[PDB]
Symmetry: C2
Subunit: 573 residues, 2 copies
């Protein structure tokens, strides 16, 4: 009875790979004379392996990268077989009666140690490559596992206590049929990849790796949240059928286009994808997105190891605008600084990042950032329908200062003979209770709103989106957040503008009737949620939803508001 | 031209003390037979001082604490004069030709080192006392000043880069005519003491200690925010006129009259003190408080090095209730966990304490805490008018769960033959935008509200109360916070309850007309602000303020709302 958090639903069958967090222990105790001969043979026998295994890595480099990387291995291998090492390693064991792992370490460490004495950063790095050769040699004599994770020749499941971002890059996605780990939870980098990759995986197992040995055959239900170890062929069967259902689920979700999200009684809304990267446009088109409702530009910034210049941004934006064809993209200016730092910025720490120097607060304290970016967006708008939207807005002051900024950047472009869509619409995230409160005022000043309920929930309830200890209090489906949502939508409509929603509520099956009834114009979500929500929309009656929404907005209690929603679903489809 | 943040206004004249506890630099050059004689004399000459200075400390312990502490010094002094140390210290210098500071250190360190080898925690602490004797001896030979801060025999000003809470306790308030430091700002523990102590002091000097030497004569303006170093008598005299002008104000401000909170046209409000500790009742009575509007019980918890039991709390509450006489105290249940941790709880760290596991979220996850406390409050209500109020309320759910809790604790008391005021009124902090939003709903469920604008501002604007980098965005005088204030007050009144305010806005001269006009029933503040605000209240016309408030609530911009307030002050008194 083992249960984890399940980060991706699905089913899989394969062998289990174990990353032994293990470490090399040197035997420093002098060996016996009879052993001298035995230790040399162990070194030769252990060296015999690395000889053949190192050669296998070389061939992968040649085919994978080319001759430029293939010869580097020959140097490492040729250096290892250097006749000077054979005589020096054997002499210490024979002369000092030392162990092969302790004696061999001194030889490679001795040379690398001499290189470090050098006063050059270029020579020191090469000393790092030589040190690596001896480091693995110790594992090869002991037989410790060296799972560069790229050395996988057979399909296997990946099991580990936790994976660091570095491993995820040099990881074979095609040879790994899933990912299982006992890390903390979704706050783990690898956990997010399972979601985006759309592959079955667990991250809260707790202690599965201590129960699994490498080469173990395991079946992942990722549906009943159970793992079968060396099971009876019948379980391998149940699961196989569970996997069938999973596949049919895809097949069904895969389709239903018709006209964009229209209720039975004729009420239309937009339903779009939130994206991070051109690469997300694919999922959006796949899932029937009618455009992009939020282009989190941060994500593009974390797609690089340097701040992207005007030109890099422009290109990135242009690509998106174009990968979206006729469709509109709502490009949000950058939102760094709550749980989304970009390390390359080296910003200083804050006591409460989520109440700190975030998003617009940065771009306004460092105009080059705001300017490059807005410049880039505008210029990209010469290439496809783009909108500009600002994150973390708190005051009418902020909006006017930024529009004024746009207007300056617009002229500069005009003066440099650089097209931009003169029609370009500007809006604001309403994701602060401030913004929500002065929604009427803000609505005169912008073309549109998108409600960020992740943040709005966070500040309205003062519950950190990151904090699992109080997660039970994080309720975007509170009478408090809903009311503020309504109040924003209404603001929009009172000025004859519209409100969309890119917070996760838009994509939440349980809010869809309320969001709809409350008159939300636009929904934007993870692409994967587009069909569930579309389905709900297509099967509602809009008038009924209004009535629902209204009721819900009067409830002083979430439970009471959940009840309405449920009796609706019962009685209404 | 040096300027700091000025934490307390006033004027002072005195010598400057510098905490530059100079380090112990051991001279390690071996000595000569001819010197040998000189080093011994230096040791005897340096030992000659500590002999007389140590004796002076002994006499202070006897008069200050008693014979129990006086004899401990005799042991330390008697041990230092031990004939074994004289021969051993001199022998190493004469035999090993070592320095007195290096040779003497080995002798005291040698014995203390032997004591550490002991496997007992009780013997190890005594080794700490013996180690201290040799540690100061090195300073005595070098001659570096000795600054425990209790060894001050003359009045002086205290100058330091920053002071740790430990120093503030063993600090002589009567011999320190002020405090000056270059710490971060008000977020510094010592900075809060200047406010409560009501003594002139600066904490943001930036680099005054590097410009001042001990024994320097300095005059603190704390009015023009300037410091005069060795000035002419002319500056002193000007500064003496400034000092005197400060006293005149105290005199005018010390004036007190019954029914102090009534506008010209007859509108009354309560005006009370926020307190932390019975000790604050004094300031409250001093400043004309009509009761206590917020008894931050955390502060009582940080007044101790253990969690206060039901009984300790009860006693503490009883005292307050009684030190308040006829007056009502609004006892808030405990609010730990944003910028107010209590270290003794060893709670784990959070990514955003201010959006974390704070106040009520704790007492609900650990009932013993909530129970002891509510138990204690109730029982204390048998002794004076108390109200109960809850911090960090976010939902109607929370309130009902806590009332239900009260009702359980009430019965238990009934069953144990323990009086409590059956009339006891219960209310909630409205300091979350959630609470503000569902104020109508909450108003049915409680007897009253007090708006915490420090927090409300924080969450509505998502600006950390602690974060100086964005402080410019922390505006409780936003159209967004004011609107939410109005909405809360109105909720109150619609149920026939009342709203008070213990956030710092209540005490802010610039909100007083708005708070008033918006119908706030009760103001609660630092006691020191009571007269300024009373004065403003007594000199307003209430009807005019309503009109003011209304206008202000329609402004989309702070500046625009500041303008109204100003034209008012111009035209109206």
């Amino acid at each position: 009875m083992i249960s984890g958090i399940l980060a991706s639903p699905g089913i899989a069958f394969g062998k289990a790979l174990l990353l032994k967090e293990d470490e090399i222990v040197i035997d420093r105790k002098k060996i016996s004379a009879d052993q001298v001969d035995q230790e040399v043979e162990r070194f030769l026998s252990g060296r015999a392996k690395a000889s053949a295994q190192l050669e296998t890595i070389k061939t992968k480099a040649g085919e994978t990268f080319g001759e430029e990387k293939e010869a580097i291995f020959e140097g490492h291998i040729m250096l290892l077989e250097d006749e000077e090492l054979e005589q020096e390693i054997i002499a210490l064991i024979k002369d000092k009666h030392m162990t092969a792992d302790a004696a061999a370490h001194e030889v490679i460490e001795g040379q690398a140690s001499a290189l470090e004495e050098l006063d050059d950063e270029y020579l020191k790095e090469r000393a790092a490559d030589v040190r690596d050769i001896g480091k693995r040699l110790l594992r090869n004599i002991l037989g410790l596992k060296i799972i560069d994770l790229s050395a996988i020749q057979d399909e296997v499941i990946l099991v580990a206590a936790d994976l660091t971002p570095s491993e995820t890059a040099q990881l074979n996605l095609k040879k790994v049929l899933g990912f299982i780990t006992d890390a903390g939870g979704r706050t783990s980098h690898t956990s997010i990849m399972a979601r985006s990759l759309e592959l079955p995986a667990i991250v809260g197992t707790g202690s599965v790796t201590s129960q699994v040995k490498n080469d173990d055959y395991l079946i992942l239900d990722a549906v009943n949240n159970q793992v079968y170890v060396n099971p009876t062929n019948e379980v391998i069967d149940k699961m196989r059928a569970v996997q069938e259902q999973v596949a049919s689920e895809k097949a069904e979700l895969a389709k239903l286009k018709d006209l964009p999200a229209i209720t039975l009684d004729g009420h239309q809304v937009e339903v779009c994808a939130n994206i991070g990267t051109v690469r997300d446009v694919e999922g959006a088109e796949r899932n029937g997105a009618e455009g992009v409702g939020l282009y989190r530009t941060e994500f593009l910034f974390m797609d690089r190891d340097a701040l992207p210049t005007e030109e890099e941004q422009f290109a990135a934006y242009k690509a998106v605008a174009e990968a979206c064809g006729s469709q509109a993209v709502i490009v949000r200016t950058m939102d760094i600084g709550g749980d989304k730092e970009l390390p390359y910025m080296n910003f200083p720490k804050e006591e409460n990042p989520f109440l700190g120097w975030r998003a617009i607060r940065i771009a306004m304290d460092r105009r080059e950032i705001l300017r490059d970016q807005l410049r880039a967006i505008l210029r990209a708008s010469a290439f496809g329908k783009l909108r500009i939207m600002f994150p973390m807005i708190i005051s009418v002051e902020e909006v006017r200062a930024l529009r004024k900024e746009i207007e300056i950047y617009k002229q500069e472009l005009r003066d440099e003979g650089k097209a931009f869509d003169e029609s370009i619409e500007i809006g604001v995230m309403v994701e602060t209770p401030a913004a929500a409160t002065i929604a009427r005022h803000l609505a005169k000043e912008v073309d549109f709103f998108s409600i960020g309920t992740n943040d709005l929930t966070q500040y309205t309830l003062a519950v950190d989106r990151g904090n699992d200890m109080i997660s039970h209090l994080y309720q975007p489906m509170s009478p408090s957040v809903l009311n503020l949502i309504k109040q924003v939508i209404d603001a929009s409509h009172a000025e004859g503008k519209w409100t969309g929603m890119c917070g996760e509520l838009a994509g939440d099956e349980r809010a869809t009737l309320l969001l709809l009834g409350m008159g939300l114009d636009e929904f934007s979500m993870s692409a994967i949620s587009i069909p569930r929500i579309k389905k709900i929309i297509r099967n509602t009656n809009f008038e009924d939803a209004k009535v629902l929404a209204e009721q819900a907005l009067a409830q002083p209690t979430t439970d009471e508001l959940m009840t309405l929603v449920n009796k609706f679903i019962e009685e209404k489809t």
